[PDB]
């Protein structure tokens, strides 16, 4: 009964276009394919915008006011979005490829590099009510005879410097009256002019060329004219200038070369501040902060993004995404971290709160097919097509064990026992499930009985039974632990593609090739429910198709499914443009999500392969926090969450229940009534207001009297609220009072409080213990210093 919205895109920090810094300097805007990601450098957070282009973004820009963001794709279709409210304002089609877009520092105008033309437009007014046709064109300029590489605004918004592949830099006046002031073209460079910049006083102009030459232009007498007074050269052996940026206030010049290295220079002295290398791929985009202290670089080939603090030679941000599509994903048991794997063969560990990669593992030679955590959570296992299964200790970030078959079997699926003592893998070529001992690393035995390749495995987190399904049109339940081994095969109408264990361990759901999700009772081994999915799935006609989408049967089944931790929902995805969320007990579709709106991707709408990227979801999982689910796709890891919660969803509401009446009860000191009415309304602002208004002396009284029905919901509220709240002791007092008062009830119903307790344990472990760990170290460090004999 939750509404999920796309929140952020992990696994991709930069694909192409230009990166920009916020005017305050505290945020970085990076194009990620079709969408724009915003990184909070100070708060170490990140979000991705929900709006979406038809194609990949080419150029973006944010005005100095911080109110308007303009993004333009590769065919010239622009989207104007209110940056603060994150809502799209207008769409405009400039009908030409735009290389660069820049706001004037005044913000009234923005300039467009379109072919060999410079278009100046008037910026729409954000404050005003939404206009039907807001874009009015200011001026158009045509001097260049060849495409414009870049453009630069003057600090006073009165002049623009445009550089083109005509080996020329050209200056324009934004006011017609001042045309005589600046109507000059600067020649002299032997290659493409990549950047032209004003000095801070604007008396001097610096032009940079692709060949690696910097010219200093001054207005001087031989009666007065612009002349090259000084010439500097980057003596790169073969590297060419790829991107250049300048900061007039601090006179900093940052140049990124095609060899993958960048230099920082001081002008006009040309003093090389520093020289570093990001790799062997071209540096595509370079940006400078408003204060000039942070430098952002981006390489498109490997999708690297680097924020460099050259003052202290420190790294604010240093991230590289997956080169290939993410094949699998796995949440940490508490939901603090998510592990991803790629067809390349490298695993990356991500932190949910920050959205940045903590470690990358490159032990696997071939594509990693599955990653899974143990119930303990410190250990992670991965299976790969290279023929190995590896165990990773995520406290010390080390591959402490490798499992392999006798004959190098390609593993596609993986399952780990709840006790973390048995690991099982399956293959498309062997038909046998290999079992290893975690402690010893030796093959225990091979579970035989499937006639077809094994598609999917899972242990029950509680019962510890193993379910395996295959293209043999059957599912087998293995009771491997115990003195005797039993197997129970259940027949299914079609090949089984995906499989999921209900968190209770009493039912298993399978997705088949006929587009059916069938739920079976494990103990009785009989079907208990079924869901149709063919009609719900959305699949687009591929450009190469010679048959219609409606007649097409390419992918009308789900290749991956997962239970919600409540057990009442299943999220499903496949080789299609749909992620469907079904309600198991009612067998109805809750909601359908469109994965991409990129017209480039194939599924959105004779020796040589006609192969081009297509949209597909490789893995889905629910967050153990019960607020989000993540879907691994070609573009990256899409995370949908319920954080905003604008919905009004009251519970057991009555006429006498009102936000005013809740506040009245607080003023009357009726804390139990106020808290209950706040939950019945189910308004986050009101629950927070009542929650913090209850005095410490009254908490044990209120906690003891909470009705049982509201107990799971308040426990959920504290766990989610405490993780990011500053009131550590206040939230700890509340948890202790609830646990001490309703501990027996929670024990009687573990499944009902499974997600609430897990969120609480995340807070007590990931923040509360770490605070105490610092405080206790100072206690013992202090005792040693004072109690001990000092040196002579």
């Amino acid at each position: 009964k939750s509404d999920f919205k796309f929140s952020n895109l992990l696994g991709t920090v930069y694909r192409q276009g230009n990166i920009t810094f916020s005017d305050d300097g505290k945020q970085l805007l990076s194009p990620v394919g079709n969408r724009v990601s915003v990184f909070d450098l100070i708060n170490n957070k990140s979000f991705t915008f929900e709006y979406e282009h038809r194609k990949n973004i080419a150029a973006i820009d944010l005005n100095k006011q911080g109110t308007l963001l303009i993004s333009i794709d590769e065919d010239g279709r622009a989207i104007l979005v209110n940056f603060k409210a994150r809502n799209v304002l207008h769409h405009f089609n400039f009908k030409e490829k735009c290389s660069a877009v820049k706001f004037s520092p005044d913000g009234r105008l923005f300039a467009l590099a379109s072919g060999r033309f410079l278009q100046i437009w008037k910026t729409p007014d954000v404050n005003k009510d939404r206009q039907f046709a807001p874009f009015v064109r200011h001026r158009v300029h045509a001097g260049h005879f060849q495409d414009i590489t870049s453009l630069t605004w003057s600090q006073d918004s009165r002049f623009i410097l445009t550089t083109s592949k005509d080996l020329s830099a050209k200056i324009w006046s934004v006011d017609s009256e001042e045309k005589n002031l600046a109507a000059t073209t600067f020649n002299g460079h032997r290659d493409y002019v990549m950047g032209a910049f004003f000095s801070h006083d604007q008396e001097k102009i610096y032009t940079v060329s692709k060949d690696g030459a910097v010219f200093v232009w001054e207005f001087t007498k031989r009666k007065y004219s612009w002349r090259i007074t000084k010439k500097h050269f980057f003596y790169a052996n073969q590297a060419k200038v790829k991107c250049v940026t300048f900061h007039p206030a601090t006179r900093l010049l940052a140049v990124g070369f095609t060899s993958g290295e960048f230099r920082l220079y001081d002008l006009p002295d040309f003093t090389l501040i520093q020289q570093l290398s990001m790799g062997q791929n071209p540096v595509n985009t370079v940006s400078v902060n408003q204060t000039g202290e942070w430098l952002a670089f981006g390489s498109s080939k490997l999708g690297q993004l680097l924020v460099y603090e050259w003052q202290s030679e420190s790294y604010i941000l240093k991230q590289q995404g997956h080169f290939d599509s993410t094949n699998s994903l796995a949440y940490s048991p508490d939901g603090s971290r998510v592990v991803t794997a790629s067809e390349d063969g490298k695993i990356k560990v991500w932190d949910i709160t920050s959205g940045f990669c903590l470690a990358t593992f490159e032990e696997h030679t071939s594509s990693v097919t599955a990653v899974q955590f143990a119930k303990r959570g410190q250990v992670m296992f991965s299976s790969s097509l290279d023929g190995t299964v590896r165990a990773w200790d995520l406290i010390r970030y080390r591959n402490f064990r490798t499992f392999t078959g006798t004959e190098r079997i390609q593993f596609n699926c993986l399952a780990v026992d709840p006790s973390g003592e048995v690991v099982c893998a399956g293959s498309l070529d062997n038909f046998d499930i290999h079992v290893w001992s975690v402690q010893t690393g030796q093959l225990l035995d091979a579970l035989s009985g499937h006639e077809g390749p094994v598609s999917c495995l899972s242990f029950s987190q509680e019962n510890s039974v193993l379910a395996s399904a295959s293209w043999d049109k059957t599912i087998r339940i293995w009771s491997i632990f115990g003195r005797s081994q039993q197997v129970e095969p259940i027949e299914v109408y079609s090949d089984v593609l995906a499989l999921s264990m209900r968190p209770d361990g009493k039912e298993v759901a399978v997705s088949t090739l006929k587009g059916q999700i069938s739920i079976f009772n494990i103990e009785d081994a009989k079907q208990v429910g079924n869901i149709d999915c063919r009609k719900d799935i959305i699949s687009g006609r591929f450009n190469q198709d010679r048959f219609t989408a409606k007649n097409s049967e390419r992918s009308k089944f789900f290749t991956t499914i997962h239970y919600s931790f409540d057990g009442m929902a299943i999220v499903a995805g496949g080789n299609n443009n749909s992620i469907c969320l079904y309600d198991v007990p009612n067998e109805v579709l809750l909601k359908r999500f469109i994965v991409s709106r990129n017209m480039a991707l194939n599924g959105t709408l004779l020796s040589t392969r006609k192969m081009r990227p297509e949209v597909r979801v490789t893995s889905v999982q629910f967050s153990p926090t019960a607020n989000a689910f993540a879907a691994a796709s070609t573009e990256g890891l899409l995370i949908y969450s319920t954080n905003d919660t604008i919905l009004f969803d009251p519970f057991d509401l009555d006429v006498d229940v009102t936000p005013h009446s809740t506040v009245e009860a607080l003023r009357e000191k009726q804390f139990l009534n106020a808290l209950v009415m706040a939950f019945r309304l189910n308004e986050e602002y009101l629950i927070n207001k009542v929650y913090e208004a209850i005095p410490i002396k009254e908490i044990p009284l209120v906690a003891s009297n909470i009705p049982a029905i509201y107990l799971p919901r308040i426990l959920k509220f504290i766990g989610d609220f405490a993780i990011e709240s500053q009131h550590i002791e206040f939230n700890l007092i509340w948890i202790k009072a609830l646990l001490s008062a309703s501990g027996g009830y929670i024990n009687e119903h573990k499944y009902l409080f499974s997600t609430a307790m897990r969120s609480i344990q995340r807070f007590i472990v990931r923040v509360a213990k770490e605070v105490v760990n610092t405080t206790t170290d100072n206690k013992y460090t202090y005792r040693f210093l004072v109690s001990t004999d000092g040196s002579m």
């Binding site: 600090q155 002031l181 006083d201 604007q202 001054e218 207005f219």
Partner: peptide
Amino acid sequence: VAPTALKDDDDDVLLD
């Protein structure tokens, strides 16, 4: 002025 315009010595010899 360009058309685009807006609008002691310490000795190094030291006694060793």
